[PDB]
Every structure is written in structure tokens, then in C-alpha cells.
Design a protein around this nucleic acid. Sequence first.
DNA 1: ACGTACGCGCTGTCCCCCGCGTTTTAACCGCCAAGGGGATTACTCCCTAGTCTCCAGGCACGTGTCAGATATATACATCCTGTGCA
DNA 2: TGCACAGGATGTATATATCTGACACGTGCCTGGAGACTAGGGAGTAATCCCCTTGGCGGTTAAAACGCGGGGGACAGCGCGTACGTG
Lengths: 97, 91, 101, 80
Amino acid sequence: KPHRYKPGTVALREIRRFQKSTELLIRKLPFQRLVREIAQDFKTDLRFQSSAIGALQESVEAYLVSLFEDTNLAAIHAKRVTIQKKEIKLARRLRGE
Amino acid sequence: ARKETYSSYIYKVLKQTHPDTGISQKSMSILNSFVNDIFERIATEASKLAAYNKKSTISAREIQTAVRLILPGELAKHAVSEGTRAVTKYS
Amino acid sequence: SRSAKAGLTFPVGRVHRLLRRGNYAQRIGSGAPVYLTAVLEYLAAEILELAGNAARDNKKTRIIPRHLQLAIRNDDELNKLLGNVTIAQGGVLPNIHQNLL
Amino acid sequence: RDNIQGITKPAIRRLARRGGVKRISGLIYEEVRAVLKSFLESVIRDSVTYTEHAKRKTVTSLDVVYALKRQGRTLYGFGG
DNA sequence: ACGTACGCGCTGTCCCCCGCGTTTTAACCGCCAAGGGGATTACTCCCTAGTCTCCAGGCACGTGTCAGATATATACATCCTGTGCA
DNA sequence: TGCACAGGATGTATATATCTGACACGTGCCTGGAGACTAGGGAGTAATCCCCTTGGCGGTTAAAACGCGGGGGACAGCGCGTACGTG
């Protein structure tokens, strides 16, 4: 007799788990090589401090959280629980972008 | 080298309001960014409002109408009342 | 100083000199830094008492940025005053939708 | 070479859990990855602008905070 | 790898706002001429603060000291083993 | 021969000395606090004139308001399967 959860249970406790945590969900090294990758073709041989990387990752994380909340309400307006690409284009375009 | 912050003033108003709860350093930096931002808000609104009246003098009138225009009526009402109370008590 | 005789905490000379060297106008009045320290002292006292009670709610004697985040976002005038301000290490509000339940 | 794929799919799933999303489709990671790809250019380009104006070879926290100052975002915390 | 259940396609329903004809009202004009107060321009004092100046002092910085977390003796405390017995 | 017993060989929470970290207190050089001279920018006033009103009759027109027919499109019910939930 295996013990399995029904679909829709672990997402709620993942919301309860991650919504109580203030930690960053993106690792430092792929964001480091990504920031250096975008910084490669703009100005060659640049340097980055130990600071000012968790600021970009922090504003990217919180701005993406607010974008997922507005897109989540946009998917709520469509009377379903799934997020779609047209919800991201709708909630992205209606914010003035 | 020297730097300027509002640590002792926020600690003193902290001792005036609730002298039990302490403040972390990061939230003190957030409050420093808050006062440093609203200083540029009322200062810039006083500069543009002084530029609109074709005058080169910034007085407490520009700070009064500037606070009355950039804030909601509760914060501008009590800030205008306490500000005029401190200014008229000062003079 | 003139802050103690007027009932102020923030200094008047630093704000007056900052308004002098801040390139705002040619003439600067004497009651404008007193008014500015009054408004900044009342607002900073408001954030200190709201973040102080927000720290009193979670039974902690230290103010984390989450207490200031909930203290600002839970107030209507602070959310209307600062709607674009991003607070680091403050988290979000526990907003759970009804239709997802 | 292709550091845009360093952001994992469970990372976007956890960021969807932070936003209150229950079920996630397939193109959400690609669309969110594209929005992040435009966002890092949109901030990082101004960072190279202020770094080039500042006559410096190293980007500081004041460059990022002052870079987000003119865009109305006003990022507090580090380097305020 | 399994799985199951909600997005999606399809079908029946019904109802609500568009198209158009008929009713009702808002506004411009003629009469019949009058003033009115508020920003504008010009003029005229008057006095608050820029500027220069010197005297004082106070908050960033260095150090003292306890709060909290940490690693380790220690006085028993439970299996194991000789070990003597009925 | 089956059996209880006295002491050792390992554990284990318990109490004690020790290691960071942050609050609290004692200074002194770049800040403020304050006194006096200048003066031009701010407070006050004298016409002014100029577009902006004051109150309401009628006649007529173009715009606003009402009313019904119904057609097509919003909307409920329901089966499918594959696409993400869960392990």
C-alpha cells in the first residue's frame, strides 16, 4: 500500500513553505556567469564587486514574484488555475510595458 | 574616512517611542534610504515649486504646500500641524 | 543647538547646509529646515512606531526588514505613498486567493 | 556560451510557488527566461553606462542603485 | 514511471443589447443693455539672510564588558562478563 | 547443570569553563552656533481694464431618451486525453 498525495496538495504546502522564507531561489554562479555573459558584449574586460549582484538578483526575484502574482491574478480572471503565455503577455502589456 | 548617517537620531526617537525594542543595522540602512529619499522628494518639489512662482527664495510656504501636495491628507495634515507648531514655537 | 529649543531631534544646521549646497535656489529661509526636520521627524517616528509594533507582534525585540515591510504594506497611506519601493529581505504578504482553496 | 540556460526549471517553479501559482504550463519558463533576458540587458546596459561615465572598471552598488533610481524602482538595501 | 483530471472541443439554450422608429429636452438666438472684481503693471519702502568671521562641541571611532552559543569533565547508568552457587 | 550476583566497560544527559558578537561608554577635529555689515528681493499699495456676467420670456433645431424585434453570441453541461502533479 503506497502512500501518495493527490494532485494539488504539495503545491499548497510549497506555498506555505516558500512564502515563509526570505532566501534567494537562484544560485550565485549561473547568475554570475549570466551577468558576465550580458556584460561581455557591452564592454570587454569588466569587473564586478562582491556586492551589487544580490541587488540585481533581489530586484529580479521580487519583480518576478510580483509579475507572477499579477500573472496569477490574470490566470484567475480566466477562471482556471493554470498560467499560460498569453497571461504573461497580458499582465506584461497591461503594466505599461 | 567619515560618513554621515541618521543612526543616533533614529535611536533617540526609538528611545522616545518604545525604549525596549532594538533596531538591526540593515533596517537602519533602509530608514537612512527612506529619509535620504524623502529629503530629495520634498527638496525637489520645493525646487520646482519655487521655480513655478518665478521666485529665487525657498521658505516654509513652499515646504508647507509641497508637503500638502505630495502627501495624503492625514500625513500632510498632522505634518503641517506639527510642522507649523515647531516653526511657530521656534520663532 | 536650535533643535532642543524647538523640540526637534534632527539637526537644523546639517539640513540647512545641505539645502544651501544642494543647488535648489539662491535664497534659503530659516524656517524651512525646521519644517523639514519636523516632517521627517514625524514620518520617521511613524515608521518607528509602526515597525516597533510590527516587531511587537512577532515577539521579537529587534526590527527585521520583514517587520518594516509588513508595517509599510499593511498601511494604506504608506502603500499609496510608496508603491514602487522594493525592500530588501522584507518578503511578501501572505495573500492567499479564495478560488484556489 | 549560453549561460541563459543556467536558470533551472524548478527555480522558476519555486518562483511560481512564491507568486501563488498552482499549475504551470510548458512555455512559462521560456517566456519568463526571455523577460529576464530583456530585463538584465535593460538594467545592465545602464550599469555599463554609469560605469563608463564614472571612469571605473568595476561596477559598485551605487552604480546599480543609481541605475535603478532613474527607472522609478528605487532599490534599497545594499548600497543605498 | 505512473496518473488523473482539468483545458479544450462540442452542443443546446436563452436572453440582451443593437437597429430603427417615435418622443422629449438642451441650447442658440432676439430683446434690452448695463456693470464688476481680480490679475496686471508700475511704484515704493524695509528688513532677513548671504557673507565673513571666530568660538565651541559631538558623533564616528576605539575599547570594556556581558549575552548567547559552544565544547568538554562527570556522576551515575545500562549491557557484559566472570563467578560462585543449590 | 540452571541460576542469580558483584563488579567492569562502555553512554548520556548534566553542569562548567570558553569562544564570537553586539550593546555601552570615553574621546577630540571637522562639523555646527552665533555676532555683525550689506541690499536687493519680498511685502504693500494705486489705478486699470478687460473679459466676464445677471435674469428670463418665446421659437426652433439637433441631440438625448424611450420602445420593441430578434439574432447571434454569451453561457451552462458534458465527454476526452494528454500534460503536467507526485513519487
